[model samples]
Target: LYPKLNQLSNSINAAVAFLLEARNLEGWWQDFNFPQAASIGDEWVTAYVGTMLATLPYAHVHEALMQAWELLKIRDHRPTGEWGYNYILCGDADTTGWALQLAAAVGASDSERAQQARAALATHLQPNGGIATFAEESIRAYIKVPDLANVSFQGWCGAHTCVSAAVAALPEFRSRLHDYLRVTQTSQGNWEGYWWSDHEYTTALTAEALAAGGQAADQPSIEQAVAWGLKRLCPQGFVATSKHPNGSTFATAWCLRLLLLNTVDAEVKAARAAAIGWLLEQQRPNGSWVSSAYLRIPYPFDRNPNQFPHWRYYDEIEGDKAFEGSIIFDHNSIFTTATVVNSLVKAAPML
Candidate 1:
């Protein structure tokens, strides 16, 4: 039924194979692993990728997602029924949102476990209607600990637009979330993604979730976001980030997704075609794109919260440095690959 799919079938096959080969032994994926640190699965990435795999036609993808979800199901905080980045106490809203989305994707959103996960995520909602990454009480407990007394974070208690937008897909919050997104969009039509290094990621995520609101009120906001994304489309079909002035595969993929959501104008279709070509050419022989520093942990981890800080390759970290850490990126390419995979698959149908 699709001609473009026939042309890109080889590329798609290779990309899917790369993901299958990269799964962790226990049926999950990790963003990165430190030389001496014990291995742990990234619950959020697993949920994100697991959901993507669920949409593919491959039979093995079902097996992989099942194995991945089993681990996520077991690792969620028992007391709160939330998941985190291998944390011991209360979990964060972002991870819980992704986890719950995966539960829904797998036809288990009504399950007790999924409901509790949703409940845990809801606790992060602010009076202003936006969601924060961590609950105030959880932050309070962390500050109270003897060893962590000196820690402070600007974002921990703030009602972050990015976090709220990502969680807007949850029906529980849909009534109020649209209003939150309306107020949070910047004068330039973008939203600040506190945890990510690029505006496109936040803007795209917001537009997608906001459209899911299915309310007439959301159309203006969605239109503005689409306008902003189109403006950023480079002549070469790639978008430039602060770090990658030439073009960023990460940002381009995200912007492409946002454009795909809207009706195709002649410009939008051309931009999509350019982006698809650019992304296809960037794929490595190993069936991966070079990982970029798109994700980050903001203060109190880094002094500069808005910048894409220098991250390390496996060989970049010094063994003797007692406190070396990065504010951005994981060494693994799965996250980036998955995003591009999604954009291409979705783009193929449109093409």
Candidate 2:
């Protein structure tokens, strides 16, 4: 159930350098953190990088991470208890789950804000036992995002990984959260995910949550998820971003993290080794992964109309050509590649 994650030291050094160069003065994801999005730097990417850094082989990036942490302390986008991928939308389960994990890591877990925020996460809990993406009042779709079924409603618990992190943050909601996730398992063994592609994202998050809840490695839901995830390996061994062999670097990273963090079994070991071998074969000389498009901020909205006069325009309002050019293809080589370095390093014990 393991691969030698630290075997690629040169790759590790190169990736760290690449991500540091990509960061702003603060060590954060900045592709969307430009002038229009400066005030509300994407917290999902930030929390991810920060959380990954907490388990990495590097120290040089720690200063930048601290800077990013300082930046998050007063991010204009989120209220204390919640966060959203965008500024206009109210906070929801996904972004807030990542945010809370980072907050606990930064030693800010005991504040009044933490209490209030933790309390609100329950708002997304479902009658069916799965955590929904956001509370009803907080839901908003990103423009140009494809209509993935079950994603619009919160019933798809694939995005529910954040729930586990929330429970981990407070430990108070542990009982209800654990029960809800277990109860929500589908007969086929996969949680219906909100993701347009593979169930890896939700499955990884769900499995991690279950393990955190003290569910055994052989637990029913956990076992089923691993079986479902192993089916995602392509012939080439790159964990498919979708349900196949070829996919984006982000999806591969998600699968890698899942395998690294989960409990061991023979099938998992084979999958982990193949993934690691494929990653070794796949990295570029430039220390970046192959260019892969993702849906980080698919819509390039202007600032909130209430605050800035320029904010009124939606890419949707503009014509197709304008929309095409204005849309953030958000091909984040840095984000995914940095995540890869962190994932592999974290899989191995600290050097």
Candidate 3:
């Protein structure tokens, strides 16, 4: 009983097992929408999960990650040699950014595939020094949206918080991206994103970009984000957004990931313990956390930038959200579980 009660290691081991078992036969993970499994098993979800799995110190994940790398090799855009939304002809900054990180971690960053990814991201950098997701040319060539070329879709196509942080995975962009993150930190000390639910998702990615990847000068933004996170942690150890006042596993896991990055601070350390405890209790018997709507598509993914009201939650819209292609979620729980697995793996060592 005592040996079985090693909660942190036990949780880590179980989560890792579940992930290993959960892999598609071809060695990739998929994200899905609410109604009828709209999309599944694509390039972006593979890279997203592969990046998180790359952080683990475990030996078992090496082959799994290698298989994922192989799949990514085949998924690259044939002509441009970059990644994009699953099964899409156009390459975007977000997909390319995450794929670059995976390449750096599990594959060869110097490889031609990685070089094209870098080249692709370089083109996505806006004139204002911020990185946008989709290129207008790609949108015009591949996407069939009405008058997309004439429209200024800065919201989805322009440089934004979460996408910019993802772009920071490329070291050259770190210094260039610092000001964008610093200037964007809200008065409450959190940064918001165009695609994510609210502050926590974007804030977690931003803090990680600075703390784990940024130069020494990135400390101020990190400190401010830490202070904000410390305040939002509920007494019960979980974190919740204004939209979900009760509690949200997605938000809690994201905040926990951010806190784990700064465990050296006393407040962060205590917060980490509380959050870890709460998270462990929430894990299901099958070793996955419940899925929540962390990502959203904003009004056809071409709306103006920083348009919050236009982005609605899964439940926020009572009238057939998924059918309309407005709100999307990983109803299968792979994304949330991958996030929780990463957070638990980081917390395991401290315990």
Candidate 4:
């Protein structure tokens, strides 16, 4: 147990180091210019890094958080309303939630900056109470301002809204956010869409939202999601994103974290224990996953039969000949790796 704890601690520390190296002195991670011109990925790294540093036992992460806070201070203002994925130049609700969560974690009390960010996000809420990934106009522009193109404002905006609500500690936000969580529930009892192909990450955010709204953990919807997640676990401790066979440390950590958060039942507890053991076993010597395979685009050609037609259309529109062509690498993506490590560390106790 002592050796295992040391291993976990080392893994967490290595993740922190990676984040620090990737982050600029001002706190922004290195930027890669994409056509959309949004912050792209920095907001997520800030949120996950801040959350882990604040909650975990590591001390060095605190300095990293403070520097990140400094960077955030410049970008928290709005007419842009919410935080951007890059810096203050471009604001999106999804990234705004991530920034808000980081600010809240580090004692950015209920200041006007935070309120402005929240209000910015609130303005984008759909009439049905769902949140869209970005403004409708932004989405349209991304598609070349095509006439009469139907835009579906559905995505992981719901997940981010729940996350933002929890960070802001606003009861009304929580109340308004519950539908976002509930609506994402699939007929199969799991949540599916962009950020969540499984109940793990989405369920964690949903559990936080429900808990804040004074809902019990054993609520039927929450319970069903947890059970659906558990059913995905493989004997070797993998958790599949779907009913099919493939699984990874990323999905496994997330599923285990969700189960641990919602239950103390002995069986559930033991399952979490097993899952953690699996995660630790999978951890590489340098504290990273063995490959970036799990971080690859989750949706791929052939695998997602339903999406093939639309993907083909998109390829044609973009003038790309091959369906499986050049892949985009998200360099310095500490956010993905950090979140996975933090989730495992947090859920380790149940294991």
RMSD of each: 3.4, 7.9, 3.1, 5.2
Q: Give the range where candidate 4 is weakest over 10 consecutive residues by summed lDDT.
A: 292-301
Compute each candidate's TM-score over C-alphas.
0.87, 0.72, 0.88, 0.77
Instruction: Compose the digit string of candidate 3's lDDT tens values, residues 1-351.
Output: 334238776787787788778777666787764444334536877788888888787777877777778888888545777776566446778877888888888757888888877876777777667788776666656645453445554556767778997787678688778777777788887888877765677898888888866467778778888788888898789887665676777888778877766757887887877888788888899888888646766643444435545555555677644422254667668778888878777666664
- Count of clashing pairs, candidate 1: 0
Which pairs of residues have clashing backbones in candidate 1? Answer: none
**Cα lDDT computed for each candidate against the true fold:** 0.73, 0.55, 0.73, 0.57
Deviation in angstroms for 42 in model 3?
A: 1.7
Clash totals, every prediction? 0, 1, 1, 3
Q: Tens digit of lDDT per residue, candidate 4, span 104-125?
A: 7666747667777777777767
Per TM-score, what order, best first?
A: 3, 1, 4, 2
Please estimate how well model 3 matches the true structure, expressed as its whole-model Cα lDDT: 0.73
Q: Indicate the residue-level lDDT of 112 in model 3.
A: 84
Q: What TM-score does model 3 achieve against the real structure? A: 0.88
lDDT of 4: 0.57
State the lDDT of candidate 2 residue by residue for 16-60, as single tens digits: 777777775544574332223323446666766676666663566
> RMSD, model 4, all Cα superposed?
5.2
Task: Output the better candidate (2/3) by lDDT.
Answer: 3
Candidate 1 lDDT (Cα, whole model)?
A: 0.73
